[PDB]
Amino acid sequence: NAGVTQTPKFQVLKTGQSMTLQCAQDMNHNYMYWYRQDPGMGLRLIYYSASEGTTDKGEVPNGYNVSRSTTEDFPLRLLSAAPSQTSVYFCASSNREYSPLHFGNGTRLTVTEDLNKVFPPEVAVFEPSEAEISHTQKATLVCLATGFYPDHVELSWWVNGKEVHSGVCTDPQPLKEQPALNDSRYALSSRLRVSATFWQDPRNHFRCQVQFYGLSENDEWTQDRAKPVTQIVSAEAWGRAD
Amino acid sequence: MRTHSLRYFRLGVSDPIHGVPEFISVGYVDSHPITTYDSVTRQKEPRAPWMAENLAPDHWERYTQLLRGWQQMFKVELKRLQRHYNHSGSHTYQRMIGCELLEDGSTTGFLQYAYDGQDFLIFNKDTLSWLAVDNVAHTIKQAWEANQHELLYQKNWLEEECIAWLKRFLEYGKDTLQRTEPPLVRVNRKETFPGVTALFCKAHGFYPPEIYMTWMKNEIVQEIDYGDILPSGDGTYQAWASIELDPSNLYSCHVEHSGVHMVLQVP
Amino acid sequence: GQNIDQPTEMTATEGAIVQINCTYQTSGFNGLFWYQQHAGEAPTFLSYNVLDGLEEKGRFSSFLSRSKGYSYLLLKELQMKDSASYLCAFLDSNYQLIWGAGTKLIIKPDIQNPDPAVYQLRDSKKSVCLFTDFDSQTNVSQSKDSDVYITDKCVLDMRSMDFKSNSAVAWSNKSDFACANAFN
Amino acid sequence: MIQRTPKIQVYSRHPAENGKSNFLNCYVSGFHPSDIEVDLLKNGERIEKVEHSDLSFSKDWSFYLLYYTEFTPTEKDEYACRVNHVTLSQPKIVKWDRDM
Ligand SMILES: *Cc1ccc(O)c(C(=O)O)c1
């Protein structure tokens, strides 16, 4: 069994838009739940369903509705997107009212008054310091993703076109480029550290990929700049003796 | 002081006849119904005015949702049992759970299930184990015993939660549940056959329904005929105990109710 | 189902022990849960207690005192992968699941041979600075200068050289900005 | 599979007296399964104004019900309780004993 499948993982909305978050489980669980997670507080129940064919309000149901016409599915509907609904949403299921919850992977959702505030990242790879190489026989690449809104990105490292995890550390939260503004654009940094010898091999191609989540190809756009659609932005460096 | 008890029964019927609810839940404090739910109303409702007056709407709303869940779970459990036994047609599935609070403040807690009105599974909350009557019950027993967290949950509910609910409801219903209506007790001579007299000791108007009635000689008489403790319809009960006489001993009816002892000697 | 409290954040060292406390007040109780939530991930079930006492599985223990309204999650032999939010929750008499605000557990790597340095990376066709190889007792302050960005401390695991290191990155648009001084 | 046929007991709330307002009780108990039909009769005819408790549950898994109606007994008025259940090939009639 797949457990709980929740989509989408990321969504930006304009104030006033409606949206359905899908949630399904193949575990024959009676209970399904919708929570929002906001900084500095516990999960807050929006709605729950004790069984197929019944639903009931949680602690913060206002602005949302649900349905449970099947055991498998518990869709959450945002009736009229407001900024206060910017949050992370988790779908969950449990066999019973007292058994452990199984959670979906969540939905990061941002509501903006104005889609002109949406910007894809610029991505740049900074090659290792020659002083680091000489002092440590290690070589730290840095990837910088800058100027993006909302903060809906996944940064991966690719070596010779295969994703890598060893020697990677990515900032857990995008930083604000202007912490005054409520609609500040964001930056994110990541390091990949390899041996000096690995960096020195010109057979080694290094690639920072940033998957950004923004507008749909379907969305209207009347700015001069490129429509800031969901897109992968990447930069690259090649290994080099010296 | 006397024992008090909180019990919740469930009845599931597969392929019920038109009308017959697929599922019913009723709660009792002592002999009084306090709560009802069924698959037709899909609502949990008070069955006593003192439950209605003391539990706000959000109580009934919340238990309504829990009972819709338990109703669905019950339907699946019965369907599975029928599959295990390879039974077609309509079968019944019952659960009873509850606790007693005694005089001393000591407690009991119990949980059992029946299939077609016969004992199927009985919980032992001290050994955290299930007694299974046959092979199919043994199969369910294994599944339930493999979930240590659920067994510990059940033990805690029986010992702490069930007793806290009982005390809350006893307070709510104090004027009904903790009152005494003493019995009106009388002795009737009846010639049951020519030259044969029987004595009837009859009690009515009493609450609670627990009562002790016996006949004694000058020693307890043998072969005493007992009437059931029957509801009179007004919240009180009635019962009797009879002996047949041999054509010299002195006979006396002894009755005990709510800490009062009475003797009716017939001359 | 009134109130639940757990510390906002705890910091401990790799290889050591951390006890995460959770207190609750309720009239009515059907059990207390701990969930683990990795950054950007779903909470996952860790533990369930309902009677008084202690359950252990591997490096994790969960304790419950009913009379004190008190639980702890005990992590032994701490690993970098234990870095996560730990959520305490309990069931009230009506099976209402009441969630704590979560405890963020930060694990400091054990740096046997600290070698702190600030390096300047090769620019891309901006200037980037890297503070690395410092001891886990060093905390990286954010910049005063609003044109100079500094990330939090990040812990990197080069399994390829069985080596761990702390780092922070700093960057600026300024034509007056030196890597050497950027981190204080 | 074990079916249990109902126990059927007919009696007055109070000691009966001719011309004295009483209630006539029919208590049907110890039966399984739960489906049951109960009528109170006056001279073999179905009484209209009859109340009953909800189905009730015993710990031995059987069910019970109380059916009752307000009445004033006389000397020539026959009261009975008629019960049908899957265990009964025809409805069973239990006459009231007029309290012996
Ligand atoms: C209203 C209520 C509470 C608790 C339980 O166990 C039941 C039931 O078993 O039907 C009902």
Q: DSSP characters for A138-174?
A: EEEEEEEEEEEBSS-EEEEEEETTEEE-TTEEE-SSP
Interface with B, mutate which of C34, C45, C51, C62 (most B CBs under 10 A):
C51
Contact A21, A75 (CB under 8 A): yes
Contact B240, B200 (CB under 8 A): yes
Check whether B39 is labelled as a binding-site residue. Answer: no
* Domains in chain A: boundaries: 1-113, 114-239
Cα of B75 to ligand 1 centre, how many Å?
A: 16
Judge: D59–B24 Cβ closer than 8 Å, yes or no. Answer: no
Contact A55, A33 (CB under 8 A): no
Q: How far is B117 from chain A, CA to nearest CA, in Å?
A: 26
Element (H, E) at A237: strand A231-238
Q: Does C70 touch chain A (CB under 8 A)?
A: no
Structure tokens at B3: 């024992």
A199 contacts: CB under 8 Å, gap ≥ 6: A128, A133, A139, A141, A239, A240
Q: CA B201, CA B253: separation in Å to the nearest integer?
A: 6
Judge: C122–A187 Cβ closer than 8 Å, yes or no. Answer: no
Q: CA C174, CA C181: separation in Å to the nearest integer?
A: 14
User: Could you give the number of structural domains in chain D?
Assistant: 1
DSSP B87-113: --S--EEEEEEEEEE-TTS-EEEEEEE
Q: How far is C92 from chain A, CA to nearest CA, in Å?
A: 10
CA distances from A124 to A129, A228, D39, D49 (A): 16, 18, 89, 89
Q: Residues in chain B whose beta carbon is closer than 8 A to a beta carbon of chain C?
A: 59, 62-63, 66, 149, 152-153, 155-157, 160-161, 164-165
Cα of B27 to ligand 1 centre, how many Å?
A: 7
Q: Which amino acid is at B233?
A: G
Structure tokens at A193: 């550290």
Q: What CATH number has the domain spanning B184-266?
A: 2.60.40.10
Cα of B99 to ligand 1 centre, how many Å?
A: 12
Check whether B43 is labelled as a binding-site residue. Answer: no
Question: Atom 9, ligand 1: which residue's CA is nearest?
Answer: B8
Judge: C30–B63 Cβ closer than 8 Å, yes or no. Answer: no
Residues of chain A contacting C133 with CB distance shorter than 8 Å: 136
Q: How far is A2 from chain B, CA to nearest CA, in Å?
A: 22
Q: CA A28, CA B75: separation in Å to the nearest integer?
A: 13
Element (H, E) at B80: helix B57-85
A190 contacts: CB under 8 Å, gap ≥ 6: A142, A143, A155, A157, A168, A169, A170, A171, A208
Report phi then psi at A128, rounded to 5.
Answer: -60, 150
DSSP strand pairing (B45-46 vs C148-150): unpaired
Report phi then psi at B138, rounded to 5.
Answer: -60, -40
Give the Cβ contact number of residue B175 at 10 Å.
8
* Domains in chain B: boundaries: 4-178, 184-266
Pocket test for ligand 1, best of B6, B7, B8 (most atoms within 8 A of CB): B8
Reduce the DSSP state of residue C82 to 3 states and report it: helix
Contact B134, B140 (CB under 8 A): no
CA distances from B259 to A9, B107, B208, B240, B262 (A): 69, 21, 11, 19, 10
Asked how this structure was determined, the answer is X-ray
What is the residue whose two structure tokens read 């990447």? Answer: A234
Question: Atom 7, ligand 1: which residue's CA is nearest?
Answer: B8
B104 contacts: CB under 8 Å, gap ≥ 6: none
Q: CA A8, CA B254: separation in Å to the nearest integer?
A: 77
Contact C7, C20 (CB under 8 A): yes
Contact C100, C21 (CB under 8 A): no
Q: CA A148, CA A184: separation in Å to the nearest integer?
A: 9
Pocket test for ligand 1, best of B25, B29, B163 (most atoms within 8 A of CB): B25
A41 contacts: CB under 8 Å, gap ≥ 6: C101
Question: Atom 11, ligand 1: which residue's CA is nearest?
Answer: B8
Report phi then psi at C103, rounded to 5.
Answer: -115, 120
Q: Which amino acid is at A135?
A: H
Q: What is the rounded (10 degree) CA torsion for C95, A35, A103, A15? A: 160
Q: CA C111, CA C164: separation in Å to the nearest integer?
A: 7
**What are the DSSP E strand ranges found in A171-221?**
175-176, 186-195, 205-212
Q: CA A111, CA A82: separation in Å to the nearest integer?
A: 6
Judge: C120–A129 Cβ closer than 8 Å, yes or no. Answer: yes
Enumerate residues lining ligand 1, CB below 6 A: B 8, 10, 25, 27, 35, 63, 70, 97
Contact B47, D54 (CB under 8 A): yes
CA B21, D1, D3: angle at the middle one, nearest 5? 65
Q: Pick from D65, D80, D76, D79: which is nearest to D6 by CA?
A: D65
Header resolution in angstroms: 1.8
Q: Which atom of ligand 1 is nearest to the CA of B63?
A: 1
Beta bridge partners of A47: A34, A57
Beta bridge partners of A193: A140
For residue D16, give the CATH number of its domain.
2.60.40.10
Beta bridge partners of A149: A119
Structure tokens at C6: 């757990």
Q: C15: left (phi > 0), else alpha (psi -120 to 50), else beta?
A: left
Kindly report the length of chain A.
242
CA distances from A211 to A208, C41, C75 (A): 10, 17, 35
3-state secondary structure chain D: CCCECCEEEEEECCCCCCCCCEEEEEEEEEEECCCCEEEEEECCEECCCCEECCCEECCCCCEEEEEEEEECCCCCCCEEEEEECCCCCCCEEEECCCCC
- Name the residue in chain D with its Cα closest to that of B110: D59
Q: For residue C159, what is the DSSP state?
A: G
Domain assignment of residue D30, yes or no: yes
Q: CA B221, CA B214: separation in Å to the nearest integer?
A: 8
What is the residue whose two structure tokens read 């029946």? Answer: B114
Per-residue burial over B203-236, b if 16 or more Cβ lie within 10 Å, else e, is bbbbbbbebebbbbeeeebeeeeebebbbbbeeb
Structure tokens at D46: 């179905």
Question: Atom 5, ligand 1: which residue's CA is nearest?
Answer: B8
Q: What CATH number has the domain spanning B4-178?
A: 3.30.500.10
Contact A34, A76 (CB under 8 A): yes
Check whether B59 is labelled as a binding-site residue. Answer: yes
**What are the DSSP E strand ranges found in chain B?**
4-13, 23-29, 32-38, 45-46, 92-101, 107-115, 118-124, 129-132, 184-193, 196-206, 212-217, 225-226, 230-231, 237-244, 251-257, 260-266
CA distances from A225 to A43, A209, A220, A228, D25 (A): 39, 22, 13, 8, 88
- Name the residue in chain B with its Cα closest to that of C92: B161
Judge: A235–C124 Cβ closer than 8 Å, yes or no. Answer: yes
Reduce the DSSP state of residue B132 to 3 states and report it: strand
Residues of chain C contacting B57 with CB distance shorter than 8 Å: none
Q: Which atom of ligand 1 is nearest to the CA of B26?
A: 10
Equal CATH topology for B4-178 and B184-266 = no
A107 contacts: CB under 8 Å, gap ≥ 6: A6, A7, A8, A9, A10, A11, A21, A88, A89, A90
Contact B237, B231 (CB under 8 A): yes
Picking from C27, C50, C96, the nearest residue to B156 by CB comes out as: C50
Judge: C119–A132 Cβ closer than 8 Å, yes or no. Answer: yes
Judge: C122–A126 Cβ closer than 8 Å, yes or no. Answer: yes
What is the residue whose two structure tokens read 């452990």? Answer: A100
Q: Pick from B169, B238, B96, B133: which is nearest to D58 by CA?
A: B96
Give the Cβ contact number of residue A133 at 10 Å.
19
Structure tokens at C163: 């080596």
Cβ contacts below 8 Å, chain A against chain B, sum to 31
Q: CA B201, CA B264: separation in Å to the nearest integer?
A: 9
Kindly report the length of chain B.
267
